[PDB]
């Protein structure tokens, strides 16, 4: 496909899931070859794995003393829409969580795409690779299309669930919300996270029950959201990705580990 930016500036705002603070975004058009980058307090922070500074419960980026928390959801939306050149100006410390899914970003950006004049240079997985960490694993292999499978094993009524995204089915994952388990809430707050989480932006589950009165959007909403997360972390390769991925219980740390191994393989090709 063609490289793409946005036609006009787009703004979003609201509380961040981990800081609990209100922040504002402005998405700016950029010319061919710019890449995806954040901008904060006069500093550009490229959306690339070299700038990852935190991977526990979110993926955070930083450069020259300026940090942005929770980039995975906006990056996933930009990856799915193959937006390749854009500056995300952040006034605040975190990307807004909005309703917990990518939907509001996706719908607004999708109607505001500007095609540009050169083709995308995709990051094309060239050979199989496996990374592992204490029973979690992620595999990748070549594919002409982006295909991403997540398999989870939940310690509550959800049990084992599996979901596969393929190109063309973007609407199946951009509405899946972030989620949390009630028995983990106290620890997440103690380690300084989750300050913005509420039933308005998080699917909260117990051992046997659903806290949200509206219930789940899909019976497998959590693994759909985990696929959505992984697609955002994969965009830290710096280009839209072609390959077939399978994650068993992976999280941001393992996602970024895979990204860094893939980037090392193609550093000069
Ligand atoms: C899903 C992830 O873990 C992923 F990493 F796997 C991760 N999400 C996260 O890491 C993550 C972590 C925590 C929260 C939260 C919360 C919260 C929600 C409501 C209340 C309110 N109470 C609920 C009970 O009744 C009384 C009221 C408290 C706290 C959300 C999200 C991801 O999406 N990263 O991109
Ligand atoms: Cl490769
Ligand atoms: Zn997420």
Numbering used by the authors: 2 to 270
Kindly provide excerpts from the paper associated with this entry.
Here, we describe our discovery and characterization of a biphenylacetylene-based inhibitor of LpxC, an essential enzyme in the biosynthesis of the lipid A component of the outer membrane of Gram-negative bacteria. Twenty years ago, the results of a study by Onishi and coworkers suggested that inhibition of LpxC, an essential cytoplasmic enzyme in the biosynthesis of lipid A in Gram-negative bacteria, was a promising strategy for countering Gram-negative bacterial infections. In view of LpxC’s key role in the biosynthesis of lipid A required for integrity of the outer membrane, the testing of LpxC inhibitors has revealed potent in vitro antibiotic activity against a broad spectrum of Gram-negative bacilli—including those harboring mobile carbapenemase-encoding resistance genes.
In order to visualize the mode of binding of LPC-069 to LpxC and to compare it with that of the previously studied inhibitor LPC-058 (14), we determined LPC-069’s crystal structure in a complex with Aquifex aeolicus LpxC, which is used as a model of Y. pestis LpxC. In the inhibitor-bound structure, LPC-069’s curved tail group occupies LpxC’s L-shaped hydrophobic substrate passage, and the terminal morpholine group adopts a chair conformation. Interestingly, the crystal structure featured two different head group conformations for LPC-069. In the major conformational state, the Cβ-substituted methyl group of the head group interacts with a conserved phenylalanine (F180) on LpxC, the hydroxyl group points toward the solvent, and the difluoromethyl moiety interacts with the conserved, catalytically important lysine (K227) and histidine (H253) residues in the active site. This type of interaction is consistent with that reported for LPC-058 (14). In the minor conformational state, however, the presence of a phosphate molecule in the active site causes LPC-069’s head group to undergo an ~120° rotation around its Cα-Cβ axis and thus distance itself from the protein’s residues. Given the very high phosphate concentration (~1.25 M) in the crystallization buffer, the minor conformation is probably a cocrystallization artifact rather than a bona fide binding mode.
